[PDB]
Amino acid sequence: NPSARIMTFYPTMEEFRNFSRYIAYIESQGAHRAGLAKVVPPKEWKPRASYDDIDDLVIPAPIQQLVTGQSGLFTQYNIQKKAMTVREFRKIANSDKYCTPRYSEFEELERKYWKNLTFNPPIYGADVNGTLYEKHVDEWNIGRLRTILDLVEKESGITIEGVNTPYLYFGMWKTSFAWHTEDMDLYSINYLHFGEPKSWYSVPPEHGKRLERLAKGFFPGSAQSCEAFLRHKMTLISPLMLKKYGIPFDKVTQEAGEFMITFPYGYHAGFNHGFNCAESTNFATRRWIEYGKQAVLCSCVKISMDVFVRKFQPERYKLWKAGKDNTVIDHTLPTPEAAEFL
Numbered sequence: 396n397p398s399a400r401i402m403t404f405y406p407t408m409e410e411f412r413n414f415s416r417y418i419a420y421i422e423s424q425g426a427h428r429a430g431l432a433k434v435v436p437p438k439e440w441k442p443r444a445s446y447d448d449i450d451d452l453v454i455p456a457p458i459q460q461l462v463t464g465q466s467g468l469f470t471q472y473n474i475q476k477k478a479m480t481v482r483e484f485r486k487i488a489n490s491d492k493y494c495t496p497r498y499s500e501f502e503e504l505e506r507k508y509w510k511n512l513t514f515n516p517p518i519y520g521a522d523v524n525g526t527l528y529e530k531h532v533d534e535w536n537i538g539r540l541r542t543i544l545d546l547v548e549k550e551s552g553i554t555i556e557g558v559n560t561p562y563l564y565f566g567m568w569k570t571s572f573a574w575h576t577e578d579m580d581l582y583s584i585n586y587l588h589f590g591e592p593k594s595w596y597s598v599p600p601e602h603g604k605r606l607e608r609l610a611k612g613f614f615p616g617s618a619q620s621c622e623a624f625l626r627h628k629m630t631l632i633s634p635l636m637l638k639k640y641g642i643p644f645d646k647v648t649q650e651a652g653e654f655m656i657t658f659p660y661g662y663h664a665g666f667n668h669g670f671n672c673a674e675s676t677n678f679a680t681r682r683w684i685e686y687g688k689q690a691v692l693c694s695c696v697k698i699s700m701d702v703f704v705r706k707f708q709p710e711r712y713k714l715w716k717a718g719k720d721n722t723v724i725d726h727t728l729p730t731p732e733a734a735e736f737l
């Protein structure tokens with residue numbers, strides 16, 4: 396993948412049964428270079444029979460997304476509103492004031508998003524604790540992926556909501572997710588259960604530092620206030636701005652029934668086309684260990700790396716605790732679990 400373009404994968408039912416092995420396969424294919432990959436599930440796979448029984452589901456803290464800024468540079472302020480049901484959210488979403496405008500091609504809707512981002516603030520039904528998967532679904536179940544991230548809960552019982560538990564996101568037109576990498580630079584999985592599409596922008600992890608540098612120049616007050624202010628998830632940057640400053644990036648639209656995988660240190664941002672619902676959580680592979688050790692956290696979610704270093708890096712353990720671990724990450728290298736596909 397020399398241009399680090401977003402790749403799409405079509406596993407068979409057999410390939411879909413082992414989650415961790417398929418992540419290892421897409422890395423041996425070079426998917427991790429883009430920082431984002433699309434996975435289309437087998438036609439015989441269904442995580443839920445129907446979504447017509449969730450109208451009374453409560454969104455306890457919906458947020459009004461106020462956006463301030465100009466010239467492709469914006470700050471998003473999330474204003475907590477009173478709790479509302481899925482039914483109440485959907486009615487606002489499909490109303491004359493908040494529904495999706497007319498569009499023939501993506502570029503037209505994308506132009507409309509960047510032109511009207513600061514106007515008529517929408518409501519995002521974000522960070523809802525929960526799952527939409529039926530109990531019996533064993534394949535790609537966001538509630539129980541069985542990766543090495545499970546070690547945190549196994550050893551302490553500690554749960555970090557949205558990180559080692561699922562989050563639901565009820566979107567509407569122009570709802571957004573700002574530029575960020577995951578907590579502890581972990582991997583993420585996002586499934587679009589139903590509704591209108593979700594568009595994504597990604598910056599390859601091998602160019603991640605270029606975006607950080609650009610963000611520091613444009614918001615110097617924030618950079619002096621926090622070591623990793625992009626973790627506040629308030630910064631919106633248009634693709635025209637990334638193009639102007641030579642930041643390599645790619646874009647993709649996720650449709651209902653599709654998965655998106657984000658990779659360690661893979662910067663991403665995007666927006667919802669209209670009323671929809673996504674389910675998400677973080678996960679890990681052996682390659683993540685180094686990212687978690689080297690991750691720059693908010694200085695204004697921290698996972699203890701000790702258990703991971705002791706279990707998967709005992710040879711490099713003594714050097715790390717002393718502070719002499721001078722390991723440099725090669726963002727092009729696939730996870731060691733990919734060896735069988737190479």
Ligand SMILES: Nc1nc(-c2cc(C(=O)O)ccn2)cs1
Nearest residue numbers: 564571572576577578585593673
């Ligand atoms: N670690 C985090 N990742 C997110 C996040 C949200 C979305 C979404 O709203 O669709 C998509 C991708 N990442 C938010 S906090």
Ligand SMILES: [Zn+2]
Nearest residue numbers: 576577583657
């Ligand atoms: Zn994310």
Ligand SMILES: [Zn+2]
Nearest residue numbers: 621693694695
């Ligand atoms: Zn901070």
